[PDB]
Ligand binder design. Structure first.
Ligand SMILES: [Mg+2]
Ligand SMILES: [Mg+2]
Lengths: 220, 86, 63
């Protein structure tokens, strides 16, 4: 029990416990076209602080703020995976649906890139089963559906008190997302980079949970 | 015959409900603790009160006037947490 | 059981208030991570008002 408290509280005392600072950098993000955005006309009002500027009507996302947000997002993602937490990948975009679905399978986590039913997260007992454990974290690789409206899971997750780590483009609403990561979600190199970063972040969290467990077993 | 007479005497009497805001309205009448949740959680500290009961009529093709009853209640534990719903 | 109001405040604000109230006796696992590692901006709901009048955007042109 006390040692069970020790292993749960051990990674809370180190900011760089998982050594995630070496996975990415400003140069790495730049080559993935993460600093590009939509036209100036589609600029959402809440994304103004996260915009470095506009280049000939094309918004440019400030990667310096992206790196600060992404560092916390990956750090937060690993810790909830370390504590045996359910992670759901949600992305309603019909160009990376297979890639995101395969990404979750490799990490061992769940994905939902299909049509989102109305009463899924809220009326969980009727949709899924009598006793269902709700996901402890939701990852949004795209916060918009195919009709350019905010995704339902963004609103429902806030109702059920489920933290959401979602990539927000220049036309998204980061208001309800607790860990927004301003970036590009349209270019294939950008979307592939985010999946791989969350692939290694989960795998390291799963492995380092097992390593400390082995040390605990030989402790007593 | 005495048993049947006793049975009649035990049916005329009606329990005096909790007096609400008035003698006939349901405002301020408590309904007891809310039902336990699907996870087995029990809420006996919470108490609920009725704030407004009003009959609502709607026009339907077949029946005509479809009377429906809506109520607005508030729940609270007395420790600073309370809520309302309809 | 919980609070389902989106506009009252952040998920963190409602969770710690219910726990302090005494209704939620089982602390969620993600709560401990949140206290140690807070995000840059607390997720408070805000209505996307449309800009009227002489007010313009603060985004600078890249030249
Ligand atoms: Mg986009
Ligand atoms: Mg009277």
């Amino acid at each position: 029990n006390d040692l069970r408290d020790r292993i749960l509280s051990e990674p809370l005392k180190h900011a760089d416990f998982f050594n995630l600072k070496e996975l990415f950098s400003v140069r790495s993000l730049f080559d993935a076209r993460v600093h590009l955005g939509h036209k100036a006309g589609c600029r959402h009002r809440f994304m103004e602080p996260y915009l470095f500027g506009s280049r000939l009507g094309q918004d440019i996302i400030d990667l310096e703020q992206t790196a600060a947000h992404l560092q916390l997002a990956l750090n937060f993602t690993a810790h909830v995976a370390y504590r045996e937490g359910i992670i759901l990948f949600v992305s309603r975009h019909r160009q990376f649906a297979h890639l995101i679905e395969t990404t979750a399978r490799d990490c061992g986590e769940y994905a939902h890139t299909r049509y989102f039913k109305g009463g899924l997260l809220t009326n969980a007992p009727l949709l899924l089963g009598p006793g269902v454990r709700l996901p402890d974290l939701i990852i949004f690789l795209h916060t918009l559906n195919n009709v350019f409206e905010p995704h339902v899971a963004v609103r429902d997750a806030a109702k059920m008190n489920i933290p959401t780590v979602g990539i927000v483009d220049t036309n998204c609403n980061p208001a309800l997302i607790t860990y927004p990561v301003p970036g590009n979600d349209d270019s294939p190199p950008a979307v592939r980079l985010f999946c791989r970063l969350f692939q290694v972040a989960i795998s390291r969290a799963k492995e380092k949970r097992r390593q400390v467990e082995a040390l605990y077993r030989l402790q007593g | 015959v005495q048993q049947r007479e006793e049975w009649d005497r035990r049916r005329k009497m009606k329990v005096k409900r909790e007096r609400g805001w008035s003698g006939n309205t349901w405002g301020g009448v408590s309904l007891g603790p809310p039902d336990p949740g699907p996870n087995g959680e029990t809420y006996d500290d919470f108490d609920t009160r009725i704030l407004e009961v009003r009959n609502v009529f709607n026009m339907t093709a077949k029946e005509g006037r479809k009377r429906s009853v809506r109520v607005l209640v508030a729940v609270g534990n007395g420790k600073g947490a309370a809520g309302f719903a309809i | 059981a919980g609070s389902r109001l989106e506009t009252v405040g952040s998920i963190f604000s409602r969770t710690r208030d219910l726990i302090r109230a005494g209704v939620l006796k089982e602390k969620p696992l993600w709560l401990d991570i949140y206290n140690a590692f807070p995000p840059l901006r607390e997720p408070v709901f805000r209505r996307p008002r449309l800009r009227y009048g002489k007010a313009k955007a603060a985004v600078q042109d890249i030249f």
